[PDB]
């Protein structure tokens, strides 16, 4: 059960469906990761669906779920509930494509590196490049979650969460 890994999967599938967005369960790590992805231009944006914002959303998809009921729309309702159980809230992720028809995703791939048992930490001197430095590693440092480029600039090491390109 690796939540960060399961988010990468969802993201990828939604992309392959040519979807505009998708929801994922809240997490503070996930949020710092999405913030890297947004900052680097790999996603368009992401929203925390809390307070008044969560209400708004549920109504909308509810409305839409209700007219011309095509499959794969009630799911969002479904999803929108289990993600707000407890102290936790749903994240709405807005996907970025380059072309109007959404055939060219900003994300070519996104893959978990560090995992259970098979941890991957990089030191100051051994901070990896991704795709010749055209992609990114997302790394958890003692100064926050950031790119390999930034970790290097900050002369820091950390756990390598993911490669993205």
Coordinates of C-alpha atoms in Angstrom, one line a residue:
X1 CA 0.0 0.0 0.0
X2 CA 2.0 3.0 -1.4
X3 CA -0.3 6.1 -1.7
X4 CA 2.2 8.2 -3.5
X5 CA 2.7 5.4 -6.0
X6 CA -1.1 5.0 -6.4
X7 CA -1.5 8.7 -7.2
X8 CA 1.1 8.3 -10.0
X9 CA -1.0 5.5 -11.5
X10 CA -4.3 7.5 -11.4
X11 CA -2.6 10.5 -12.9
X12 CA -1.2 8.4 -15.8
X13 CA -4.5 6.7 -16.5
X14 CA -6.5 9.9 -16.6
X15 CA -3.9 11.3 -19.0
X16 CA -4.3 8.3 -21.2
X17 CA -8.0 8.8 -21.1
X18 CA -7.4 12.4 -22.3
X19 CA -9.2 13.7 -19.2
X20 CA -9.1 17.3 -18.0
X21 CA -8.8 16.4 -14.3
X22 CA -9.0 13.7 -11.7
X23 CA -9.3 13.5 -7.8
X24 CA -6.9 12.0 -5.3
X25 CA -7.0 11.4 -1.5
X26 CA -5.4 14.2 0.5
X27 CA -1.8 13.9 1.9
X28 CA 0.7 16.6 2.9
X29 CA 3.5 14.8 1.0
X30 CA 1.3 14.5 -2.0
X31 CA 0.5 18.2 -1.8
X32 CA 4.2 19.1 -1.8
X33 CA 4.7 16.8 -4.7
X34 CA 1.9 18.3 -6.7
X35 CA 3.4 21.7 -6.0
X36 CA 6.6 20.6 -7.6
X37 CA 4.7 19.2 -10.5
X38 CA 2.8 22.5 -11.0
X39 CA 5.9 24.7 -10.5
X40 CA 7.7 22.6 -13.2
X41 CA 4.8 22.7 -15.7
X42 CA 3.9 19.1 -15.6
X43 CA 0.4 19.7 -14.4
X44 CA -1.8 22.8 -14.9
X45 CA -2.9 23.2 -11.2
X46 CA -4.4 21.4 -8.3
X47 CA -7.0 22.4 -5.7
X48 CA -7.6 21.3 -2.1
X49 CA -11.3 20.5 -1.9
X50 CA -12.1 21.7 1.6
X51 CA -14.6 24.1 3.3
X52 CA -16.9 25.8 0.9
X53 CA -14.9 24.6 -2.1
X54 CA -15.7 20.9 -1.4
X55 CA -19.5 21.7 -1.3
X56 CA -19.4 23.5 -4.6
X57 CA -17.7 20.6 -6.3
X58 CA -19.9 17.9 -5.0
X59 CA -23.0 19.8 -6.2
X60 CA -21.6 20.3 -9.7
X61 CA -20.6 16.7 -10.4
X62 CA -23.8 15.7 -8.7
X63 CA -25.7 17.9 -11.2
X64 CA -23.7 16.5 -14.1
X65 CA -24.0 12.9 -12.9
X66 CA -27.7 13.5 -13.1
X67 CA -28.3 14.6 -16.7
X68 CA -27.5 12.3 -19.6
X69 CA -26.0 9.8 -17.2
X70 CA -23.0 8.5 -19.0
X71 CA -20.8 6.0 -17.2
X72 CA -17.6 7.2 -15.4
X73 CA -19.4 10.2 -13.9
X74 CA -21.0 8.9 -10.7
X75 CA -17.5 7.6 -9.9
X76 CA -16.4 11.2 -9.1
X77 CA -19.2 11.5 -6.6
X78 CA -18.1 8.2 -5.2
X79 CA -14.5 9.3 -5.2
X80 CA -15.4 12.7 -3.8
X81 CA -16.7 11.0 -0.6
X82 CA -14.1 8.5 0.4
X83 CA -11.4 11.1 0.0
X84 CA -12.9 13.4 2.7
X85 CA -13.3 10.9 5.4
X86 CA -11.7 12.0 8.7
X87 CA -9.2 14.8 8.9
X88 CA -8.7 14.2 5.2
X89 CA -9.9 16.0 2.0
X90 CA -10.0 15.4 -1.8
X91 CA -7.4 17.0 -4.1
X92 CA -8.6 18.0 -7.6
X93 CA -5.7 17.8 -10.1
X94 CA -5.9 19.7 -13.3
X95 CA -3.9 18.0 -16.1
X96 CA -1.8 19.8 -18.7
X97 CA -1.7 19.0 -22.4
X98 CA 0.2 21.0 -25.0
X99 CA -2.4 20.8 -27.8
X100 CA -6.1 21.6 -27.9
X101 CA -7.0 17.9 -28.7
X102 CA -5.1 16.7 -25.6
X103 CA -3.0 14.2 -27.6
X104 CA 0.3 15.6 -26.2
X105 CA 0.5 15.3 -22.4
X106 CA 3.0 17.5 -20.5
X107 CA 3.8 14.3 -18.6
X108 CA 5.5 11.6 -20.7
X109 CA 6.0 9.4 -17.6
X110 CA 6.1 9.5 -13.9
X111 CA 7.6 6.7 -11.8
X112 CA 8.1 6.0 -8.1
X113 CA 11.7 5.5 -7.1
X114 CA 12.1 5.0 -3.4
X115 CA 9.7 2.3 -2.1
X116 CA 9.2 0.0 0.8
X117 CA 12.3 -1.9 1.8
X118 CA 13.9 -0.7 -1.4
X119 CA 14.6 2.8 -0.2
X120 CA 16.5 5.2 -2.5
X121 CA 18.3 8.1 -0.8
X122 CA 20.7 10.4 -2.7
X123 CA 23.6 12.3 -1.1
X124 CA 24.8 15.8 -1.8
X125 CA 27.4 14.4 -4.3
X126 CA 25.2 11.7 -5.8
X127 CA 22.0 13.6 -6.7
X128 CA 20.8 11.9 -9.9
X129 CA 19.8 13.6 -13.2
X130 CA 16.7 12.4 -15.1
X131 CA 16.7 12.2 -19.0
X132 CA 20.0 14.1 -19.3
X133 CA 18.6 16.8 -17.0
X134 CA 15.5 17.4 -19.2
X135 CA 13.4 15.5 -16.7
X136 CA 13.3 15.8 -13.0
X137 CA 13.7 13.8 -9.9
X138 CA 11.5 14.8 -7.0
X139 CA 13.4 14.5 -3.8
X140 CA 12.4 14.8 -0.1
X141 CA 15.1 16.8 1.6
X142 CA 15.4 18.2 5.1
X143 CA 14.4 21.5 3.6
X144 CA 11.2 20.3 1.9
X145 CA 10.2 18.5 -1.3
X146 CA 11.9 19.8 -4.4
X147 CA 13.6 19.1 -7.7
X148 CA 17.0 17.6 -8.2
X149 CA 18.1 20.9 -9.7
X150 CA 17.0 22.7 -6.5
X151 CA 18.5 20.1 -4.2
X152 CA 21.8 20.5 -6.0
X153 CA 21.6 24.3 -5.8
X154 CA 20.9 24.1 -2.1
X155 CA 23.7 21.6 -1.7
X156 CA 21.4 19.0 -0.2
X157 CA 20.6 15.3 -0.3
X158 CA 17.4 13.4 0.3
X159 CA 15.0 10.6 -0.5
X160 CA 14.3 10.2 -4.2
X161 CA 10.6 9.9 -4.5
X162 CA 10.2 9.9 -8.2
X163 CA 11.4 10.5 -11.8
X164 CA 9.3 12.6 -14.1
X165 CA 9.8 13.6 -17.7

